[PDB]
Structure formats: C-alpha cells, structure tokens
C-alpha cells in the first residue's frame, strides 16, 4: 500500500510517500521492496531498493520533483523482489496550481 501526503504536486516541491509491507494476513513483514517512479509517458526516472527489515512494515521515502518536467498523471510502482509480476501502483498528479479558498459541491 502506497501513501502520498498530497494528491497533487507542483514542479519544484517534494513528494513524501510511504510503502506499507504486509502479508496475506495483513500483518507486517520484513521483505525487499523495489520502488520505481514513472512519468505521464510511462518512463521510470527513479528506482530504489530498500528493505522493511526491522522497520515494522513501513518504508518512509521522498523524491524531489525538478522544475523542468512534464505535467500530468504520475505513477509510483512498487513490488516485492520475490514477485516482479505482482506490481502495486498509486498515482499523483503534477500541475502548476494554487490552493483556492472555497470548495464547490454538486449534488
């Protein structure tokens, strides 16, 4: 399970994401995880290889988004080293935005 602090990011900021490692019983486990980050056009730019060993099934990570980069839908793909075929992914949008001051609901 991948968790990102925000849902959308601006070019230049930092993305804080944690990877939760558990078994079929949802209980934490220490394994080797391969984490990649692809751009809108499906092109990996950063790849890590950390282990949740003695980390209580929580892998804190972070990556800085360069100013010069394509906007759109980004994806973070992670998978256990013992099963490359099974991949988990979570998307985060990159766009030049500015936080509004009010929300709008359409019901």
């Amino acid at each position: 399970f991948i968790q990102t602090d925000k849902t959308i990011y601006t070019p230049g900021s930092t993305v804080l994401y944690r990877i939760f490692t558990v078994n079929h019983k949802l209980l934490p486990v220490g394994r080797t995880v391969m984490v990649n980050i692809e751009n809108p056009e499906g092109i990996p730019v950063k790849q890590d290889s950390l282990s949740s060993q003695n980390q209580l099934g929580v892998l804190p990570l972070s990556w800085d988004i360069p100013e010069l980069v394509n906007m759109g839908q980004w994806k973070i793909r992670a998978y256990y080293e013992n099963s490359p075929q099974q991949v988990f992914s979570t998307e985060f949008e990159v766009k030049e935005y500015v936080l509004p001051s009010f929300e709008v609901i359409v019901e």
């Binding site: 925000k6 900021s13 804190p60 936080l99």
Partner: protein, 47 residues
C-alpha cells in the same frame, strides 16, 4: 503611534503556509487500558 490602532512594526505577518505537514511517526507504548493505548500529542498549528 498614539492612534487607537496597531503600528506596522507591531504586526507579525503569517508566513508558514504549508500544504502538507505533521509528517511524523509515533508509537503507542503507553500503559494500555482495555487494549486501547492513548498518546497525547502537542502539535503546532500552522499559519
């Protein structure tokens, strides 16, 4: 200064405007009661 107002030198502007904070990690090792621990955190709200 004597006016019924606050001078410019006395107005501390708000600058801390984060979009996401409190990226912390806390463990619940406190004395359990009914299988439910309780940690009291003292956070510092932003501007």
């Amino acid at each position: 200064l004597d006016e019924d107002i606050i001078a410019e030198e006395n107005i501390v502007s708000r600058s801390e405007f984060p979009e996401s904070w409190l990226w912390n990690v806390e463990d619940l090792k406190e004395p359990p009661k009914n299988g439910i621990s309780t940690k009291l955190m003292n956070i510092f709200l932003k501007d």
